[PDB]
Write a protein that binds this ligand. Sequence first.
Ligand SMILES: OC[C@H]1O[C@@H](O[C@H]2[C@H](O)[C@H](O)[C@H](O[C@H]3[C@H](O)[C@H](O)[C@@H](O)O[C@@H]3CO)O[C@@H]2CO)[C@@H](O)[C@@H](O)[C@@H]1O
Ligand SMILES: [Zn+2]
Ligand SMILES: [Zn+2]
Ligand SMILES: [Zn+2]
Ligand SMILES: [Zn+2]
Length: 394
Amino acid sequence: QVVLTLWYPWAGPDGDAVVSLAKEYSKTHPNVQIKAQMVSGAGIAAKFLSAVAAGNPPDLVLYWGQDALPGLADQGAIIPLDDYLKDVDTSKFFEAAYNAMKYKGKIYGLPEMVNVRVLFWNKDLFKQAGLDPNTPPKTIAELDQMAAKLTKTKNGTIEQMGFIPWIGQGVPHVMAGVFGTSLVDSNGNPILSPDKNPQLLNLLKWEVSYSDKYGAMNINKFIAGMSQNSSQANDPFVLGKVAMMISGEWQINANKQYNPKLNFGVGPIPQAPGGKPMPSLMDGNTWMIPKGSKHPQEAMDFIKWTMDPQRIADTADKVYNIAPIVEAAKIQKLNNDPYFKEVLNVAQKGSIYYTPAAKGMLSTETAANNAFQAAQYKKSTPEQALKNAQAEAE
Ligand SMILES: OC[C@H]1O[C@@H](O[C@H]2[C@H](O)[C@H](O)[C@H](O[C@H]3[C@H](O)[C@H](O)[C@@H](O)O[C@@H]3CO)O[C@@H]2CO)[C@@H](O)[C@@H](O)[C@@H]1O
Ligand SMILES: [Zn+2]
Ligand SMILES: [Zn+2]
Ligand SMILES: [Zn+2]
Ligand SMILES: [Zn+2]
């Protein structure tokens, strides 16, 4: 009778896992059929507000981060969940992941998975350059040095890249914390200009050094046709074309599924000057129920079903994420996996930081992303690009 519409933000294995959860829920709940539709970035990432405004929204969404939540809640595009949570023991969640759900006194989402950011490196290419394959770079300067050893060009044309800073999870909203800063201040206002954020300038100048060594056009010719900031069976790490890449812990899966023989290492992101050792953003996927959801109660009951310690441990194992439920992270089979053990060591030892909470986060990110790309393409200097972004953001 009741038909639940759910949007999830990616295809591939994570997409399938979600579709399969919906399927198996609908089998044992004859009165609640779920229809799962892939909509990229859940139509939110810097279609969701279009459909809420039209009165037509899904009954439930899965977003791939935590950054959009304040903005959606401040506009009342998503509903507060307090009234549906008095029978849920929310202390079973990891505290940070749950803490991310609160905005001006109310809960507006539930964490679906936990994620970390890490450095991957290709052990075969390391051995080829005479580099110890279990010795990742610890600082950015070590990284830059290693990346020069691992880069092979023939008269300008690139045959092998050691490192590209802006691919994978090398994006401004992740990397700013690595350089020990943020895109917004404590009040949630944009801090993108050199004057307001000297560490951000340092980050961009670091990035632009790569496009000055190798040529922005050479780099872009080299990765033509490859996925850049979504990690797929066609990103340049998986293809064996970049020696090192910053990505999320899920990349373990994308590596294994594209090529099982690719010998790779996973470890902490290199420390940046002005930043902390082993820096890592910890975030996660989040469930939200939009203003206009026709069956919020059924939506919450699927979500609840979803969180069951064994089930969600099986899910986190399939997609290589961290289960947001304390007890389920402990039962995950991935706990024996050598690669996932290194990921866990990062969440344990690294200097963790979290997605900042600002109502204008997404537009600031857009201004920031545009300024990075402009200075990567020598259209403006880093100082000017960041000045212009500040104007764009305000
Ligand atoms: O691939 C499954 C894996 O995805 C994780 O979410 C990531 C997405 O897949 C994308 O890689 C996404 O990239 C976007 C950034 O968020 C920025 O908005 C901007 O750079 O645009 C890019 C391109 O879309 O990043 C998210 C992580 O924030 C995550 O859901 C994980 O659970 C899952 O296994
Ligand atoms: Zn598939
Ligand atoms: Zn963000
Ligand atoms: Zn209902
Ligand atoms: Zn039920």
